[PDB]
Nucleic acid binder design. Structure first.
Ligand SMILES: [Mg+2]
Lengths: 50, 780, 236
RNA sequence: GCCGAGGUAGCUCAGUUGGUAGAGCAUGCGACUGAAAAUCGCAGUGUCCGCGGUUCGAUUCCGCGCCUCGGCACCA
């Protein structure tokens, strides 16, 4: 039970903590960093016609 | 429906072969799913006569002494094994299909068993294996090979469409083959009745459920097994013989599609009462199944004095208790027409599907009961040596079919054929109609059994088929369509072109189930579906999609998991649901991007898509621009709405990071407009042949401002003579204030008739600088 | 005389007679897809251009030309595609241009041709100087093109008297050679006072590959990288 | 609406004297490269369908309902 305990007491606390920790660390950099002027001209692919 | 060739050939004597019959039934309106030979019985199986059945002490087995030409014994654990019946004796050295290893002399519990007495499964005539076959003890001379009296049969598997319940009876089916010119042989129920009173009374209490209900009376019955021809016939049709009486009921049923059932009078009481089950009442049907009854079930009950008990689930399946057995001498024969809906309901309510209900659901001859009673009563008299009574017990007086106005002129008009009147009237008369007519429009009244003939169009169909659809000639109609039909196909050619155009640029088309996972409503942050299902293939497919991307994206994940597309530009046009069904176009970009297979320099992401998209509507000659808008499913940093020809119709951005993270997906971009796209009529406009005065000019602007507002303003005040515009560079650098950026535009002016003087352009380039100031922008 | 409409089944040797047509049409439509602007150009040819673009003189000439400039019948589509360019850049100054033309050429036999033409800054970002263009931009579209048609495509350097020796090869559709792809010979651009330019001119009808469906395996694809040191002169 | 079988790591899936929840490409840092790859340790995104149990990490007894299938009864 010492392990039955620690095996649970650790896996859940640890593995998930680190996750959600970065789940809110990485997903945080983007949200802030990535800011574009959407209404800005984009790549100039050609446009045909007949 | 299983159709035993030879059984049919008994009514239709001159049939060519199982093959031709299928060709024939084909043109008649019935296709055969399969054909198959059925009773391969080795020379090793003979008929034998159970002289005596001796119980082997200590066992549950029996030593049978059989007259198999000479005398032999056999051991058998079959309950039904008794003295005085015939059996299918498989002699030692016989190869049985149903049990493959070679039968032989074997000692069992002390007796030299000389081969074994077969069972339905063991002979290969039926799936039953809980007893031996039971032949009439005098069936054949002891020892004669069984095949000699049980030839290989051929069974066709016919699809019988709902408009032909008359066809769930071979004699009915036969009537169609007749119309093609085949001789028809109807059995002549040869009754020898006796004018005497019936020991029971009828009391139909729900004439609504039993529109027509007749009871027969056969007594002094001698129950025994059926002759071989009967047993053989029933088996080929997918049914298992059970005796004298019970078998004739099933035989007739299959023959003329009229379910019937012999109730044993010992149980009938005073009389038979056709009523509804008293909410509560219990009944144990033939299948051994003990059931409870919903007060809506139409029951066939009996009453005794002041009592009333159920005897059978009317039209569906008889009751276990009153079934006829060997010790029965008199019966009450049920032959009725039951309300199709009542049966349907009940049948399913109890999860039952019988040959009986199946027919009563589809439809029974409203006036074919009585003829049926005689056919059964006759046969009972001939195989059970019964003494049939003379009077029946009727309840209900159905009205024969009405006349149908039939003009062979129209038949030929509607078919594009020119069948001579004569052939038509002739045919109709072969199918049993009464053609009381003089011409040109006859009074055709069909046979009580044709439920599928009410209209004059129904009749014309009868000619085409009996005459052969292959006789209707080919043709092509020529006419000018009514005016409100001109251009009705614009909406279509429009969208189609669309797809075609997309497929041009580089988009890969994709179709995705209209279904939506209610969960994705949260998973992609959308509003829950308004239209859901009451019977989803799976909760995952429980609702109706409100967007096209959730799917476009999912098909992506699914791709990257089976294969790992390095990149992917996709699109889908489909119907979305929400308040109203509406067509949508969806796109999706993802991966490295567009560039050089080598040189790391790639061109991609948001602006790559807006790239194609601008390039897209460019092709369609339609106004397009994006204007940042919050969309619960797109990176707040890259998310706006799409504006086609000025009107908003969708969105364009990158999938919300938090989301990609859940579906464990990389970054991704998309858009989803709504169709049909705006329609700009074209106004040609001669382009001036006079040089376009063009000048550059940067505009220092605050970092938060969107390029959209800038240009909108420049072009606006830039004057009419302004030809082009363009943004050749965006600079957010050193020689500029804090939180600022410069937009350098490449303008270009031009006059229609003559060249322009720089004094004019300035008076314009200026007007652009003035409003650029009145607003709040600089001008490097 | 009243109005009417005839109704009949056409004789059998008339079934599908319009394939050749729907084929080419689709073609144009597909090109117009990617981004090519269609262009029609007089079938006439200036005998001089025979030398001006280094081509063989015309076999079919005229006995009554509208003007010596329009004295012969064109043997190629580009001389014109290019000329309509010069003429553009002179009336207006297109910053760039991707063009195409489908027309009848004459020489030994009349034959349909497809011609293209790229020119200008290239494809990129209206701002960010980083542009994607030139020879490989065109081969870009073209590979993208036959990609759409589901047809084999590759170039193999070949000398063509009208293309930069440095950038000039033939085009191979489904294995069979049918034209060329490269940049206009510098010496030429210089005469028509034109910047650098790229083009190609295949011959129609393009090969016809019947499709053979092929279930793709649902079992993971073992994939590995590996460089190959090769001598600079060797072609990829 | 009955017998019977399967439903487990970007994927394909065996399994059961259990230390193996994994093997086969594939995938995550050092470091061999400019940029990779064949590499050596170092490791597991895995609710082994969902709600509840099960040993020291459970897949399996075991409960009912779900994605999958054969047959069956219908008939696309
Ligand atoms: Mg009909």
């Amino acid at each position: 039970g010492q392990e039955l305990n620690a095996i649970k007491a650790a896996l859940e606390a640890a593995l998930e903590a680190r996750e959600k920790a970065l789940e809110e660390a990485a997903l945080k950099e983007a949200l802030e960093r990535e800011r574009v002027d959407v209404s800005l001209p984009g790549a100039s692919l050609f446009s045909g016609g007949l | 429906m299983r159709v035993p060739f030879s059984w049919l050939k008994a009514y239709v004597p001159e049939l060519e072969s199982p093959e031709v019959l299928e060709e024939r039934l084909a043109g008649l309106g019935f296709e055969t799913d399969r054909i198959e030979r059925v009773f391969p019985i080795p020379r090793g199986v003979v008929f034998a006569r159970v002289l005596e059945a001796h119980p082997i002490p200590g066992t549950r087995l029996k030593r049978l002494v059989l007259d198999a030409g000479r005398t032999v014994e056999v051991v058998s654990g079959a309950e039904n094994a008794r003295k005085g019946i015939g059996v299918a004796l498989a002699l030692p050295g016989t190869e049985l299909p149903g049990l493959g290893q070679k039968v032989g002399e074997r000692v069992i519990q002390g007796v030299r068993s000389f081969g074994m007495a077969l069972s339905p499964r063991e002979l290969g005539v039926g799936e039953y294996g809980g007893g031996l076959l039971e032949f009439p003890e005098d069936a054949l001379p002891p020892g004669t090979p069984l095949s000699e009296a049980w030839p290989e049969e051929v069974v066709l598997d016919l699809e019988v469409t709902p408009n032909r319940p008359d066809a769930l009876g071979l004699l009915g089916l036969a009537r169609d083959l007749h119309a093609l010119g085949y001789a028809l042989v109807e059995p002549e129920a040869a009754l020898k009745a006796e004018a005497l009173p019936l020991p029971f009374a009828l009391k139909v209490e729900d004439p609504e459920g039993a529109p027509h209900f007749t009871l027969g009376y056969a007594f002094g019955l001698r129950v025994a097994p059926s002759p071989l021809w009967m047993q053989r016939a029933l088996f080929a049709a997918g049914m298992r013989p059970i005796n004298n009486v019970v078998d004739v009921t099933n035989y007739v049923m299959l023959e003329r599609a009229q379910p019937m059932h012999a109730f044993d009078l010992r149980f009938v009481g005073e009389g038979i009462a056709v009523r509804r089950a008293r909410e509560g009442e219990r009944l144990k049907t033939l299948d051994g199944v003990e059931r409870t009854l919903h007060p809506e079930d139409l029951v066939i009950a009996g009453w005794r004095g002041e009592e009333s008990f159920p005897l059978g689930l009317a039209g569906v399946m008889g009751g276990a208790e009153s079934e006829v057995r060997e010790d029965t001498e008199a019966i009450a024969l049920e032959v009725a027409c039951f309300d199709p809906v009542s049966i349907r309901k009940t049948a399913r309510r109890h999860g039952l599907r019988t040959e009986a209900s199946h027919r009563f659901e589809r439809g029974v001859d409203p006036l074919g009961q009585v003829p049926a009673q005689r056919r059964a009563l006759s046969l009972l008299q001939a195989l059970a040596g019964a003494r049939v009574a003379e009077a029946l017990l009727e309840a209900g007086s159905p009205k024969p079919p009405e006349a149908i106005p039939f003009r062979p002129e129209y038949a030929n008009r509607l078919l594009g054929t020119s069948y001579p009147e004569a052939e038509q009237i002739a045919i109709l008369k072969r199918l049993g109609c009464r053609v009381e007519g003089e011409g040109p429009t006859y009074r055709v009244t069909p046979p009580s059994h044709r439920l599928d003939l009410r209209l004059e169009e129904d009749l014309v169909e009868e000619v085409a088929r009996i005459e052969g659809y292959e006789t209707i000639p080919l043709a092509l109609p020529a006419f000018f369509p009514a005016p409100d039909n001109r251009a009705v196909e614009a909406p279509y050619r429009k969208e189609q072109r669309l797809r075609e155009v997309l497929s041009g640029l580089g988009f890969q088309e994709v179709y995705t189930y209209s279904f939506m996972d209610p969960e994705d409503a949260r998973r992609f942050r959308l509003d829950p579906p308004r239209l859901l299902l009451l019977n989803p293939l799976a909760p995952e497919k429980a609702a109706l999609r409100t967007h096209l991307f959730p799917g476009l994206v999912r098909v992506l994940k699914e791709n990257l998991d089976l294969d790992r597309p390095e990149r992917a530009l996709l699109f889908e046009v489909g119907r979305v649901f929400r308040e109203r069904e509406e067509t949508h176009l969806a796109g999706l970009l993802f991966g490295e991007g567009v560039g050089l297979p080598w040189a790391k320099e790639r061109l991609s992401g948001y602006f790559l898509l807006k790239g194609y998209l601008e390039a897209l509507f460019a092709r369609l000659g339609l106004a397009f621009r994006v204007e940042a808008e919050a969309f619960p499913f797109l990176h707040p940093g890259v998310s706006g709405r799409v504006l086609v020809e000025g009107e908003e119709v969708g969105f364009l951005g990158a999938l919300h990071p938090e989301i990609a993270q859940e579906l464990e997906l990389p970054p991704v971009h998309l858009f989803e407009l709504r169709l049909p796209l705006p329609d700009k009529p074209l106004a040609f406009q001669d382009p001036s042949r006079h040089p376009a005065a063009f000048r550059d000019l940067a505009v220092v602007v605050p970092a938060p401002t969107p390029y959209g507002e800038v240009e909108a303003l420049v072009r606006e005040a830039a004057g009419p003579y302004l030809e082009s515009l363009a943004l050749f560079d965006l600079y957010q650098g050193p020689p500029l204030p804090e939180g600022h950026k410069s937009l350098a535009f490449h303008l270009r002016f031009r006059h229609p008739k003559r060249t322009l003087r720089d004094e004019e352009v300035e008076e314009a380039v200026s007007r652009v600088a003035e409003a650029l100031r009145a607003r709040g922008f600089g001008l490097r």
